Write a protein that binds this ligand. Structure first.
Ligand SMILES: Cc1ncc(Cn2c(C)c(CCOP(=O)(O)OP(=O)(O)O)sc2=O)c(N)n1
Ligand SMILES: Cc1ncc(Cn2c(C)c(CCOP(=O)(O)OP(=O)(O)O)sc2=O)c(N)n1
Ligand SMILES: Cc1ncc(Cn2c(C)c(CCOP(=O)(O)OP(=O)(O)O)sc2=O)c(N)n1
Ligand SMILES: [Ca+2]
Ligand SMILES: [Ca+2]
Ligand SMILES: [Ca+2]
Ligand SMILES: [Ca+2]
Ligand SMILES: [Ca+2]
Ligand SMILES: [Ca+2]
Ligand code: NA
Lengths: 525, 525, 525
């Protein structure tokens, strides 16, 4: 067998059937004779390739496979890799290298010092020392991306390797099963459960690894048994809990003092599946107030090591959430009462307030919609106004890096063809990965893109206010026609300058059979 | 003085007055109170920011200063950095880091292991250990980017550093002058000159560092004195010689055997300002034929070390080209005769052959036009058909990475406001950095963009033919309307479906007062 | 509080009370005012500092703390770090940096690019961005070294940081408890247990992480219930099983084909606490024969990813070994019968055969002796001839790197003051870390060092035979007087040129109250 045949066999035997890619000439010997059981999803720039694969992996809860061109293609994808690192996304990033005979001379298209290029944003990065090693290196990449804590990996392969003979012993790679589905030992788990049962006023804080593990329903059972309020850890990349459940308390503020004030009076705070904590603004004060202790369950040793307070347990989130939910006692405390509905903001017949947009989306979208957020100044309102009952219903760029939501919404829609995806993206953020629209058109992936057009980088005006920073250049983005950009890439486009037109465009988009972009005129900050 | 005030003083005293950027919140404390003597050039994605700065640096022959946001902004720019590394572009890339007090907890927007992120594509990469060190670290960045061999550098700065007090001794940085303008010692230079004077059939091969050094006119004098044919080294990022001078022989084929066959019969081959060599296709055979010896003058030790044949001298290209041109004897051999004009290819009233497009551009463009090339299947025809008499007249992505020419054409036009820039870009390549069009519109930078629309990644069909690779996915890019994309970003747009409309659109574009995009329907390969 | 006071408080609250070090001037501000409850163990070169700390950590099963001088001190220790990486040793390596104000100028003693220096041999490597961050960075180092898979970490600290004020919130670091004591979830564990109960001819292979976890006794119970033969995985750094238990089958040969032939006929092979596998010689063939399947339990994702065959479970070895030993059924198969005693080799009245030395050590040493091995050509005989009943009884350089056993034997003896340590070290290996002898003398740590003096690098003659390599320089080491080297560093020294003198020197050494070196004249290969 050739290295090409053996490597595609390993991929299919490990459950991989889709290649997300933008091709080049070091990759043609891999892509030739492409197997009939695989698909190839082309995107026009590599941030878009990786964003699409990232949405697909996060929504499918399985690894996604990427093929990029050498150093320039890998490099175009590195902002997308920053977000994938912070969302623990299992991405297998492959890139083609020059033929071994010209690597030393640094022929055009040589990826020099290849394994160092995507560091520090990958768990494992490698170029094999011979062609026969390629299937074993691919096996390492698959398992490194997929074991907890999941994350992106990188493999560079000289183009001449594919046609070489494979090692006949590579068949032992095909059916390897590797598990990291582990939980705390019984004695120490019993100690944790007794601490939770004994707490007088527990709180629960949930992060994105809960949604990645599909541990959401176990966390609902846990919060119901403990009768405990539930927040989402700050800077949230995913939604880990039903947002209209009575225990839900919303997104935590991303500040040290704000969080310790929020948690004041809670004797035990159990954090599951989150870093402790993804603060943003600098809000110095106490990490926790006197009387509060914190316990974190995390799948990632790096998160356990860096927490500035609390105890930690490094284990699988699905296995731990299931065990805790089934072992804790039902408290005789009263269940928390649901938060009140948000108020309706006053809306005239002109430009839309973001609050009006989210209320109208909540009124009209299906109950199993999936939302993505890259409208950076409106996140708090989005979390207050969208009822997200089901797992896998929310994604936000985990490293804060623009350029994620537009392509990731296409990958999520490909992973979840029966759930309508609605990406809410600012006019600033929409540009970073605008060419991803083409992939939605070409493959007829029916994502809805709602562009919140207020003419400016609104969140940077907000943060400038926090810093009291004046005379800052580069904050306005006037003069972009998003219906013409959508037409450029083959996507149907609608405009909404007022609430009547917002309702009409959403009705048309929800009834459409392909992707649709709606440009919404929103109020200037 | 504050670190902010001291750092902007150092920049202006070192000749920097423009910041190319896409802002974020770790950068607002640097950008606030932006000095009145500086400009800020916004672009909507970081590949575009860096591409624009790269064109500006290459055309101005001076360092360009960039400010990006943390890891995601730096990462979005890394394919642009791959090209800048291979063009020796002096780029000072700065990125903002979180406040020092939250780096350890990895707050949102922390650039983890920052200095390792852009490696291996930078000459120097650093984050200072204290605020007071920031001006000295910036001084190091300026000089590292600017000394031979020039190239990109990276500096990460915690946002809280800017408002701190500067070291009063930082004033000694402001006027430092650092020179690498060096040439081979007199005794060894005299040995080289005697070898050139004694050659019976010398050849000259020139690379991009000749054009970077503005050594073009000295190389013309050298070739006239030696009566020697002149080629351009393969995979050329720049044009180092007048293309209709009698000595000019064109772009070398990018293959080992093809180059040694071309050079057969030449006893001494002098390479100036090029790697030896940027081969592309694998074309194994002899590096040089018996009877040919090679001497390379390069500004880059890495190029001298990796050449597989020949002697080398590591020195400044401007200083060496001037010395050689003024020291060699005038040979009594006959001057080489000019190559014949290219033939006119047959053209019907339908889609345009690329040969027709380049002939029409050569007929209509000013004699001091500047061309950029990212039309990958038509490079050989472009080099045969455009008379480029002057330095700084051609740029092509030096690492072969798509996404360079569209933004770089805007930076070159900003650097050379009296020379019309004409970027010839394939329909595939145009997508990688499409949002750069917005910067041309907003600042009214009057670049002309000629999009060669043949519906496919034509060069990858070519390379697939070379490999005899069949059943390759992802090679076609149908369904893109480039006039709608140009309208989306505010640029005037024209279409040319035949030769009459090509001539009319070029006349309109050359008479326009702002940027113009022309979509040309070209023949399918 | 100062950073100095807060950092020593964090260390003591996390169970650290000993600093292994060789001092320098960047470290004096850390070491000044050394707390009365800490000890400092000086060694004269940094390979020896780290080797001693490594033996101490491995034997105590807890992290050991090291302080080295800048880049040169760290660099002198990097061969010791290679062994610590492959033994999963929890080492917290700290090094002093220049004062922040002169790092940029690269004053003498600046550790440039410090965090990159010990990579790739550490799990985590860092220099803090401010003085106040130092206690949190130390907390990260402690937990990163101690969480599974354990391993060395590195922290560089500018010397001016120690006297600065600490962050008042650093107290939340002092009592953090972090656990990685996890095992496979109940459903999948029940599947594994049923596979073991159903096997017709199971085998068990154990590696060093069994001894690190003190899982040895649980593995004896497991092998007794399964009635299964037990081997030790190749290139063994530790001894994980009693070597005269009836199930014990010895050290596996370090070859691919040799291992699959050994395992032929075993239907399920359970590997616990080992890489799969640390082969050495290249012995190509099948990884496993038809009819054998392999299951690996490992604490290290990198080991699970790279195994070329089998299933894997990534979990804590102590927790998994305990669960399996208590859940499997007692098989009705007959218990394996003990291997026969090794034969006595013929010994004349001259130089000693290694077999005679190990038989005499086994006859005379206490039953709770601890052995170290750096006598590279005699490993197989050592494993056959020493009855090691107890955990923690054997150490061998895990990366194969010379210079481990001499210093590590001193650290093991410090960790286990009531168990006699006997280091068996070749005359070649003894030189690499010879100055460690001084620390044993100065602190009166009563290690016994048995130097096997055959005048040559015996194992390299063996491997040269395997390669059929002739005319190799550098294999002989004549002319070393080890009793004079021991006298040089203050250690009592004895010579044994025959068996009578070997017995007399061992009796004298076992009765001594301080360290003793015995130089044994062994037969030339
Ligand atoms: C890759 C990248 N570049 C720049 C930024 C900085 N950035 C920018 C540019 C923001 C403004 C996004 O504007 P928008 O129009 O999408 O939304 P708002 O107007 O609601 O803020 S928010 C933010 O952090 C970033 N985070 N990531
Ligand atoms: C960043 C990046 N991604 C992909 C490629 C691979 N690539 C691609 C995609 C080419 C086709 C460009 O198509 P075009 O339409 O611009 O021009 P032609 O049709 O004349 O080839 S040429 C080439 O090397 C690349 N070099 N750089
Ligand atoms: C740091 C280092 N340097 C060199 C070696 C190579 N080496 C050497 C030099 C060996 C010979 C050790 O000789 P010895 O006298 O200690 O024992 P034998 O004579 O029994 O082999 S075995 C071996 O792998 C090594 N592994 N580690
Ligand atoms: Ca099919
Ligand atoms: Ca906006
Ligand atoms: Ca001005
Ligand atoms: Ca094309
Ligand atoms: Ca004391
Ligand atoms: Ca020896
Ligand atoms: Na990198």
């Amino acid at each position: 067998a050739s290295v090409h045949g053996t490597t595609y066999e390993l991929l299919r035997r490990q459950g991989i059937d889709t290649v997300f890619g933008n091709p080049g000439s070091n990759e043609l010997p891999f892509l030739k004779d492409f197997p009939e059981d695989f698909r190839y999803i082309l995107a026009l720039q590599e941030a878009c390739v990786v964003g699409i694969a990232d949405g697909y992996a996060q929504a499918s809860r399985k690894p996604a496979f990427i093929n990029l061109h050498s150093a320039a293609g890998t490099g175009n994808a590195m902002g997308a890799l920053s977000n994938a690192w912070n969302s623990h996304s299992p991405l297998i990033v492959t890139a083609g290298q020059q033929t071994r005979a010209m690597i030393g001379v640094e022929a055009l298209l040589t990826n020099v010092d290849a394994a160092n290029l995507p560091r520090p944003l990958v768990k494992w990065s490698y170029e094999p020392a011979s062609a026969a090693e390629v299937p074993h290196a691919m096996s390492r990449a698959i398992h490194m991306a997929s074991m907890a804590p999941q994350g992106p990996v990188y493999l560079s392969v000289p183009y001449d390797d594919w046609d070489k003979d494979a090692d006949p012993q590579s068949h032992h790679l095909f059916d390897r099963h590797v598990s990291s589905s582990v939980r705390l030992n019984d004695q120490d788990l019993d100690i944790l459960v007794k601490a939770l049962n004994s707490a007088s006023n527990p709180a629960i804080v949930l992060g994105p690894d809960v949604d990645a593990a599909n541990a959401n329903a176990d966390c609902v059972m846990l919060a119901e048994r403990l009768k405990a309020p539930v927040w989402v850890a700050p800077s949230a990349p995913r939604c880990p809990f039903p947002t209209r459940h009575p225990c839900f308390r919303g997104l935590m503020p991303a500040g040290i003092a704000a969080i310790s004030q929020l948690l004041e009076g809670h004797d035990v705070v159990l954090v599951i599946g989150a870093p402790v904590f993804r603060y943003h603004q600098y809000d110095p004060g106490q990490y926790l107030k006197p009387g509060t202790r914190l316990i974190s369950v995390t799948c990632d040793p790096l998160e356990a090591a860096r927490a500035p307070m609390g105890d930690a347990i490094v284990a699988d989130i699905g296995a731990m959430a299931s065990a805790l939910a089934n072992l804790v006692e039902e408290s005789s405390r009263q269940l928390p009462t649901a938060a009140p509905e948000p108020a309706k903001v006053d809306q005239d017949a002109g430009r839309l307030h973001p609050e009006t947009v989210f209320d109208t989306l909540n009124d009209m979208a299906p109950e199993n919609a999936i939302y993505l957020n890259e409208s950076t100044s409106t996140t708090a309102q989005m979390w207050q106004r969208l009822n997200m009952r089901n797992p896998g219903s929310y994604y936000f760029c985990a490293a804060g890096g623009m350029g994620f939501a537009l392509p990731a919404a296409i990958g999520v829609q490909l992973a979840e063809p029966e759930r309508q995806v609605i990406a809410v993206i600012g006019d600033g953020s929409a540009n970073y990965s605008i060419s991803a629209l083409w992939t939605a058109a070409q493959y007829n992936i029916p994502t809805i893109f709602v562009i919140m057009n207020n003419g400016t980088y609104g969140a940077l005006r907000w943060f400038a206010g926090v810093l009291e920073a004046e005379n800052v250049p580069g904050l306005d983005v006037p003069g972009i026609d998003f219906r013409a950009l959508a037409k450029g890439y083959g996507v149907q486009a609608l405009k909404a300058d007022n609430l009547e037109q917002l309702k009409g465009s959403l009705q048309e988009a929800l009834s459409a059979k392909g992707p649709v972009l709606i440009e919404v005129s929103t109020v200037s900050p």
